[PDB]
Amino acid sequence: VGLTTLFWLGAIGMLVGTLAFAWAGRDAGSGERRYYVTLVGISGIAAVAYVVMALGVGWVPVAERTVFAPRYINWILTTPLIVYFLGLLAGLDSREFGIVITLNTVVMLAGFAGAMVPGIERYALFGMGAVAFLGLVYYLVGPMTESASQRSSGIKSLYVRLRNLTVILWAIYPFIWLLGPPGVALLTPTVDVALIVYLDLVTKVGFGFIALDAAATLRA
Amino acid sequence: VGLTTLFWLGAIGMLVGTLAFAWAGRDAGSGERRYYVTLVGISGIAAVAYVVMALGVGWVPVAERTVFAPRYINWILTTPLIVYFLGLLAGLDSREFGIVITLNTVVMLAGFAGAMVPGIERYALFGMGAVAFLGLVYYLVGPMTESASQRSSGIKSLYVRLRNLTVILWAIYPFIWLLGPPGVALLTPTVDVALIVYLDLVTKVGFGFIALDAAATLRA
Amino acid sequence: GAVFIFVGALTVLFGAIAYGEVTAAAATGDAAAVQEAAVSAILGLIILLGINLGLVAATLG
Amino acid sequence: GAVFIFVGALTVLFGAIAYGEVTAAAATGDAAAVQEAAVSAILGLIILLGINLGLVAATLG
Numbered sequence: 109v110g111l112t113t114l115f116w117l118g119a120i121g122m123l124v125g126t127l128a129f130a131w132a133g134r135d136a137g138s139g140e141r142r143y144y145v146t147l148v149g150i151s152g153i154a155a156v157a158y159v160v161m162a163l164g165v166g167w168v169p170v171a172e173r174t175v176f177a178p179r180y181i182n183w184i185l186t187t188p189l190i191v192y193f194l195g196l197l198a199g200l201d202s203r204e205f206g207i208v209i210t211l212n213t214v215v216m217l218a219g220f221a222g223a224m225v226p227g228i229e230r231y232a233l234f235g236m237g238a239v240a241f242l243g244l245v246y247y248l249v250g251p252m253t254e255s256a257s258q259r260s261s262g263i264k265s266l267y268v269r270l271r272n273l274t275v276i277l278w279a280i281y282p283f284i285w286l287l288g289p290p291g292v293a294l295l296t297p298t299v300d301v302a303l304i305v306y307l308d309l310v311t312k313v314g315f316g317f318i319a320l321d322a323a324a325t326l327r328a
Numbered sequence: 329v330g331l332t333t334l335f336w337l338g339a340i341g342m343l344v345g346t347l348a349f350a351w352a353g354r355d356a357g358s359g360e361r362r363y364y365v366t367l368v369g370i371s372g373i374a375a376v377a378y379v380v381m382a383l384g385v386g387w388v389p390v391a392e393r394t395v396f397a398p399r400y401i402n403w404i405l406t407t408p409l410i411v412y413f414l415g416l417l418a419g420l421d422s423r424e425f426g427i428v429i430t431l432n433t434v435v436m437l438a439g440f441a442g443a444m445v446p447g448i449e450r451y452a453l454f455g456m457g458a459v460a461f462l463g464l465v466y467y468l469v470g471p472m473t474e475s476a477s478q479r480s481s482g483i484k485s486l487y488v489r490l491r492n493l494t495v496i497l498w499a500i501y502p503f504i505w506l507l508g509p510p511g512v513a514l515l516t517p518t519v520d521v522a523l524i525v526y527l528d529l530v531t532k533v534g535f536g537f538i539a540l541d542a543a544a545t546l547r548a
Numbered sequence: 549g550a551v552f553i554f555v556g557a558l559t560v561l562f563g564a565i566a567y568g569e570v571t572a573a574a575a576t577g578d579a580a581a582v583q584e585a586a587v588s589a590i591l592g593l594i595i596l597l598g599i600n601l602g603l604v605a606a607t608l609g
Numbered sequence: 610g611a612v613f614i615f616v617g618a619l620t621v622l623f624g625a626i627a628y629g630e631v632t633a634a635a636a637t638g639d640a641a642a643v644q645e646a647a648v649s650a651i652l653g654l655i656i657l658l659g660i661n662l663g664l665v666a667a668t669l670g
């Protein structure tokens with residue numbers, strides 16, 4: 109397979125999620141609709157980003173490697189929606205939501221800026237992203253879990269399951285940054301792209317399917 | 329690592345199991361003792377087999393490959409003890425026990441004979457081993473599971489867990505036979521040896537630890 | 549229970565991709581190039597295990 | 610919960626072994642030899658995933 113084939117696979121998997129989430133969503137109440145819409149934005153945006161890369165756009169040369177701008181741009185746009193979805197489940201306050209979205213955005217911006225820096229100082233930017241990510245994990249497993257524990261059993265149960273998926277899989281991305289083209293380039297561009305397609309698909313579409321499966325059991 | 333290093337690792341892991349099983353066994357009743365003794369035989373025999381291979385004995389040349397006689401001989405001796413342990417949990421009858429031990433032994437003998445045959449007809453012997461293994465799986469998940477379902481909840485629960493470990497992991501061995509030196513030799517001798525060490529350790533020592541952990545919870 | 553067939557099938561697909569890069573590198577006669585492709589395959593497969601385990605733990609844990 | 614650290618650590622140990630065979634084959638300049646070692650590494654790592662998943666499913670499923 110080539111890079112563009114993998115990008116096409118990403119785009120299609122994301123489209124399948126989006127379609128599934130949109131249609132599952134025709135069945136929802138006032139308080140439920142926001143969850144389905146959020147899943148549609150997450151996978152819909154990622155679907156378009158993958159089309160962009162597949163069409164050969166945003167392949168930025170950085171020294172002797174290629175970093176995919178749409179990769180990082182779509183994370184910047186979609187990860188706050190994932191955190192938003194989780195914060196809705198947890199029953200988060202206005203202020204604490206601002207804190208997690210900020211931390212999230214620092215991670216994504218730092219990783220994007222780092223991928224763009226040819227010199228060794230890109231690792232300092234990575235480092236800042238990594239520290240912010242640890243702060244993010246703390247909120248997810250600490251304060252946000254405390255808030256979620258006050259909700260109904262079905263909601264608490266979905267939060268913990270999506271929280272665990274999120275915490276474990278999001279922790280893998282920085283290692284791929286370090287081992288792939290942005291870091292020491294031990295992963296080929298193709299393997300790097302395949303892993304991120306898979307990871308993007310699970311953290312968005314898998315996440316969504318898990319939510320769809322629980323939501324159906326709760327209301328009915 | 330070399331082959332002998334891996335064999336030494338096998339021997340040591342098996343020894344650790346044996347020691348753990350012997351000592352856990354000082355706490356057991358009349359009806360319990362047979363379980364601990366069975367675990368000691370399983371890991372104890374495998375420990376000695378691994379010492380034998382580590383010492384460079386039983387490395388049999390077959391055409392342009394090397395098959396480890398002690399590998400298959402120790403399976404022949406220890407797998408019936410594993411089936412015996414499971415049949416005790418299931419509450420098996422005298423006759424049905426004879427059936428599963430027979431099927432088990434056919435698998436192990438066929439695989440040993442096949443590994444020894446230079447020509448293409450070794451795959452017919454493999455085939456006979458494979459059909460017997462399917463019959464074995466049937467008893468494990470069918471009749472033996474039916475018998476186990478009649479016992480106390482704690483016993484039924486351990487049987488199912490050890491049954492699942494056994495059925496899934498034992499199913500992997502034939503693929504290693506086919507892909508390793510006995511078959512098409514796509515796995516190097518070293519990788520072949522590493523996988524079997526790991527698999528032997530989990531199906532004996534992991535199996536044993538699972539049993540130790542449940543037995544403690546039941547009596548106390 | 550299906551999650552396991554998703555993971556098992558994705559793993560073979562990933563293996564096939566990695567295998568393709570090894571054989572392509574092989575076609576050159578450049579040992580270092582095959583090594584490069586193989587090191588990538590090994591790290592990638594290790595990472596893939598983490599992803600699959602994370603998925604499994606998260607849904608069935 | 611510890612089963613996951615057993616599996617994760619065993620995987621890196623297995624990876625290191627496979628990596629050693631690739632670099633050894635590399636030291637020869639024989640591309641086909643590295644390919645041979647790499648194909649073994651890939652299949653072995655796929656098989657290792659099955660073993661780890663079987664272990665995990667069996668104990669936590």
Ligand SMILES: *C/C=C(C)/C=C/C=C(C)/C=C/C1=C(C)CCCC1(C)C
Nearest residue numbers: 215219237238241278281282285311
């Ligand atoms: C749908 C996309 C997802 C869930 C993307 C998740 C990406 C991350 C968790 C990235 C994390 C990073 C760090 C923790 C350190 C700096 C480098 C990053 C951006 C790769």
Ligand SMILES: *C/C=C(C)/C=C/C=C(C)/C=C/C1=C(C)CCCC1(C)C
Nearest residue numbers: 435439457458461498501502505531
């Ligand atoms: C402690 C040792 C164990 C649990 C060994 C298990 C070995 C097997 C389940 C072997 C199975 C085989 C077949 C199903 C087909 C023929 C080839 C064999 C013997 C490798």
